[PDB]
Amino acid sequence: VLSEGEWQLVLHVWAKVEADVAGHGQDILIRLFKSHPETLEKFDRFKHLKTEAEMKASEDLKKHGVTVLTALGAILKKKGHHEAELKPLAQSHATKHKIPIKYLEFISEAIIHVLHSRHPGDFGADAQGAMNKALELFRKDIAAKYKELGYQG
Numbered sequence: 001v002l003s004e005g006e007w008q009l010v011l012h013v014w015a016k017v018e019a020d021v022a023g024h025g026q027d028i029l030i031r032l033f034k035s036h037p038e039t040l041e042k043f044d045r046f047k048h049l050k051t052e053a054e055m056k057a058s059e060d061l062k063k064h065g066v067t068v069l070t071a072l073g074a075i076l077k078k079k080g081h082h083e084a085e086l087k088p089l090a091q092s093h094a095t096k097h098k099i100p101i102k103y104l105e106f107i108s109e110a111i112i113h114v115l116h117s118r119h120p121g122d123f124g125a126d127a128q129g130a131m132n133k134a135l136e137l138f139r140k141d142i143a144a145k146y147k148e149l150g151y152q153g
Ligand code: HEM
Pocket: 039, 040, 042, 043, 044, 045, 067, 068, 069, 071, 072, 088, 089, 092, 093, 097, 099, 103, 104, 107
């Protein structure tokens, strides 16, 4: 599992993300969309935005970045005991949104990059390793639920 010490590192960085969720979630989604254009085609509501400027300008995109980080936050503060939060998310993303497990790996890279941009002194190699472990556990448990449903990535 993650140690209690690695959970400390994780949550101490997330409490700073919580100071500007809407700004963090907007950077993250933007980085996802640009590095991996195919993910944007998953979103009928966003599929019109072609440039970075248009993305930055959208209130609705910012609303959805708040949705995602809040749900991730709920999960991270359960330190592993996240079965009840995670189960509905796997079901919707499997059966309704149809999101490949690989795209969950892409947004995981985006979160880590943005956390490093916005919080260097605070997000050293050690906190980087703890956060990547916590995201892998997230991916790992959703992937198990996908397999059960017949979607396995
Ligand atoms: C940490 C990653 C993610 C979290 C915590 C997360 C969380 C959520 C939540 C809470 C919702 C709204 C309720 C739901 O539909 O069940 C949602 C909706 C959605 N998510 Fe995810 N999501 C994540 C990653 C992704 C990725 C990587 C994609 C696409 C590449 C994606 C695409 C969508 C779409 C299409 C919706 C619905 C948007 C709309 O209202 O039309 N999600 N997600």
